[PDB]
Design a protein around this ligand. Sequence first.
Ligand SMILES: Cc1cn([C@H]2C[C@H](O)[C@@H](COP(=O)(O)OP(=O)(O)OP(=O)(O)O)O2)c(=O)[nH]c1=O
Ligand SMILES: Cc1cn([C@H]2C[C@H](O)[C@@H](COP(=O)(O)OP(=O)(O)OP(=O)(O)O)O2)c(=O)[nH]c1=O
Ligand SMILES: [Mg+2]
Ligand SMILES: [Mg+2]
Ligand SMILES: [Mg+2]
Ligand SMILES: [Mg+2]
Lengths: 373, 373
Amino acid sequence: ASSRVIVHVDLDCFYAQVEMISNPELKDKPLGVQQKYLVVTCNYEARKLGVKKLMNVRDAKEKCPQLVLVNGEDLTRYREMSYKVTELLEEFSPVVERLGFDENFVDLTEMVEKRLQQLQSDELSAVTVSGHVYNNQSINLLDVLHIRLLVGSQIAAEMREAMYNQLGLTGCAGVASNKLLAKLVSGVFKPNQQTVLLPESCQHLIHSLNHIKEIPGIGYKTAKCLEALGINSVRDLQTFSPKILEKELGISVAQRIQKLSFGEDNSPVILSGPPQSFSEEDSFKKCSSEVEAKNKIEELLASLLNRVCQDGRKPHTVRLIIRRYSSEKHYGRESRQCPIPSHVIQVMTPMVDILMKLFRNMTLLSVCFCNLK
Amino acid sequence: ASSRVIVHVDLDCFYAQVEMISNPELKDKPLGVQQKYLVVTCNYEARKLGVKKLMNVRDAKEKCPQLVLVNGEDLTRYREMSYKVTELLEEFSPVVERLGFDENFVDLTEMVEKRLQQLQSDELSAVTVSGHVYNNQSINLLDVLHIRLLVGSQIAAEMREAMYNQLGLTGCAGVASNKLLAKLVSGVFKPNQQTVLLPESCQHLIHSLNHIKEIPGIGYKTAKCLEALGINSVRDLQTFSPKILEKELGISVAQRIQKLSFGEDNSPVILSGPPQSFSEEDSFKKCSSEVEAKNKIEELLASLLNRVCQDGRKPHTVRLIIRRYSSEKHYGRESRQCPIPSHVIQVMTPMVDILMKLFRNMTLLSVCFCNLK
DNA sequence: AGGACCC
DNA sequence: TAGGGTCCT
DNA sequence: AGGACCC
DNA sequence: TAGGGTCCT
Ligand SMILES: Cc1cn([C@H]2C[C@H](O)[C@@H](COP(=O)(O)OP(=O)(O)OP(=O)(O)O)O2)c(=O)[nH]c1=O
Ligand SMILES: Cc1cn([C@H]2C[C@H](O)[C@@H](COP(=O)(O)OP(=O)(O)OP(=O)(O)O)O2)c(=O)[nH]c1=O
Ligand SMILES: [Mg+2]
Ligand SMILES: [Mg+2]
Ligand SMILES: [Mg+2]
Ligand SMILES: [Mg+2]
C-alpha cells in the first residue's frame, strides 16, 4: 500500500467545446465564450491570434476583431456535460475526484495491478507507452514503476478515446505518481494529448515552473507572503528554512507547501460524488438600488428550485451573498446562512420571504442551497 | 410516520453515585464531589442539608460542616460508566443520543408499536402505567396515544431496572412525545423515579416553568436578550411577535425557540455513536508564567495519548485552548487548530513540539484531539 | 476560530 | 464557576 | 461567517 | 475579473 498510479484528466477549452458542439458552424472560427465583460475561455483557433483565457472583451476584440462570442453566463449545459464526463470515468474506477467542471482525478492504482496480474511473464517485455513521455526520458522495462506508469498511460488513452466516442469531447491526461505531479504534467502537451511522468524526471518537472504560484495549493495570498520573504523560485521554497516558514504561515500551510515544492504530495484521490451545494449568482456594477433588488433574488430562485429538485436530495440550509461598491477591496463577500424549515423541504412564496429577512440582517448577488441529504 | 414515543434517561447525582459505589463507606453520609473550588454535585443526603449543585466549597462547608469531599477532576471512571449506560440502552433500541455524561434519549417509537402488535385485542384493556403520570392526569385506555405512552413507560421501567441490576446505577426517566417534553418531564419526580406525560398536560408542564432559561435550547445569552425585550414568562414568549423576534435573534434562533415555548419540538433522536473528540483540561488562576507552562501541556498529552488510543480511531487534528487574567470577561477562550501529520498518526516527542508552535501563534490550558476516523 | 448551547 | 462535549456560522 | 484555494 | 464549487478555522 505504498506507490500509486494517478491520472489527471483535463478537457480542452471546455465551455468553447460545448458551444462548438451545439453550433457546428462555430468550429474552425475563432471562438470565445463571454460572461459579462470577460472572455472566460476561447477555442484553439482563437488562441493562435493572441486571445488568452480570462481576457476582457475589449482586449479580445482589439487583439482579434475577427472574433465570435457567445454568452456562457448560464452554466446548465456545461454542468451537464461535466457530470457525464465524471460518470464515464467512474465506470473505469469508481473513485473519481472532481476539480472545477472539467478536471477529474482517478486513482488507477488497483486497475493497473489487475492488468499486470493478467499478463503472463513475457508480453510484459512489449509494454509500451501511450502518448508522450515527459522530458523525453527513456524507459526501463525492468523498472516496475515505469511499467505501472506505462500501463497507467494506456488506461488514460482508453479513457480519452471513450470520452471522445461517447461524449464527443477532447482533452489531455497526465499520469504520475501523485495528484500534484499528474496535474502538473497533464498540461505539458497542450491541445488533445497525454503525457506520463517517470520518477526520474520529477525534479525537472517541478523546476520547469517559473513562479511558486504555479504550484497547485499555493494561491494569490500565500504567494504574496512567500515573496515578502524572498522566496520566488520553486528552489527558494525548497531550501527555505522550515522553522521560519513554519512560523509565518502556520505549521499546516507550511509543512505542506514545502512538501509540494519537492513534488511530494500524499493526499489521496477522494470520491466527489454528488455535489455539496448548488448556487446561482449574478453580477451588475452597483446596479442594486437596495430592495428594488429582491426581484433579482426571485430569479436565482426560480432556477435553483428546479435544479435542486432534479438531483432528488433536498438542501437543509439556504444562504445569501453580496458585495459593495469602491476602491478595489474586491476580496469582500458577506453572507447569512439559515436552516430551511422542515415544512418547505417538500414552494417559492415562503422561500422568498426567508432570504429576504436574511437580506435585512445585511456590486453583486447570489443564492446557495447547501447541506444536501 | 407522525407521533413518537421518546424516553429521556437522567441519572441521579451521577459523579457522586460513581464515588459511592467505589467507596461504600461514603453512602448515607452527605457527599460532595469537588473540582477545584467547586462542589460540582452532591448526593441526596447532602442536598437535605442545603448543599446545591455547583456551589463553591466555602458555602458548602458553612452550609454543611459535616461534609465529605472527594476529588472529581479526573473524569475517567465517570466516562467509563457513562458509556456502559449508553451501551446498555443501545441494546433496547439502537438509536440513542447522549447529552452530557448522564443523559440519554431513546426513540422508543418502533419498539412500542412492536409490543402493541403482539398484544391480542383484549389484554390491551389491562395496559397499565409504570411510574407517575404527570399532573396526576387520568388515563383513557381508548386513546391510542395514552396507550403507546404507557407502553413507553414500561420500556422505561425495564431500562431503569436493567441499569440497576447490571451497572448498579439509579436514575430518572421521562416518557413524552418529543425530546423537549421527555426531558422536561423526567425531572418532576426527582430522586429515583419516572414520569410520563399525556398530551393533554403539555401546556401545564410548559407553564409550570418559571423562567424561559429553563427551556432546553434557550441559554445564558438568548435569555438575557429575550428579557431586554420584556419576554420573561413562557407565555410572554408564546405570545411575543414573530416578526420582532424573527428580526432580532434571526429567523433560526427565533422560529425555533418560539416552537419550544409551546412544547413543540420536531428534532429527531440522533445516534451519538463514538465520540467526535477527546480532550483534557486544567485550571489554575493566573498560574501560567508564559512557557514555564509547556510542562502543563506535556501532562494533558500523556493522558490523552493513552485514551485516544484505546478507542482505535485516530484523530486527524489537534487543538490548544487558553484564557487570560482580568475583570470578568470570563466568556473568552482562544484556540489554534492544526492537522496532525500522517506520520505521527501511528510518539509524544514530536506532538509536543506541534502544540508548542501552536502555543506561540498565541488562567487556564487544554488540549483537544478532534476529527476521529 | 469563535459562538452558543448542554451536562 | 469544573471539566467535558456537540453543532453552527 | 469568513478565508483560502481551484476551475 | 465570470460563475461556480470545496474544505478549514
Ligand atoms: C479558471 C477558470 C475557468 N473557468 C471556466 C472556463 C473553462 O472553460 C472551464 C475550465 O477551466 P480551464 O480548464 O482552466 O480552462 P479551459 O479548459 O477552458 O482551457 P484549456 O484547454 O487550456 O484547459 O471553466 C472559469 O469560468 N473561470 C475561471 O477562473
Ligand atoms: C451541569 C453540570 C454537570 N456536571 C457533572 C456533574 C454531574 O454529576 C453530572 C451530571 O449533571 P446533572 O445531571 O445536571 O447533575 P446530577 O446528575 O449530578 O444531579 P441530578 O440527580 O439532579 O440529576 O455532570 C458538571 O461537571 N458541570 C456542570 O455544569
Ligand atoms: Mg484546467
Ligand atoms: Mg481544461
Ligand atoms: Mg441532568
Ligand atoms: Mg443527572
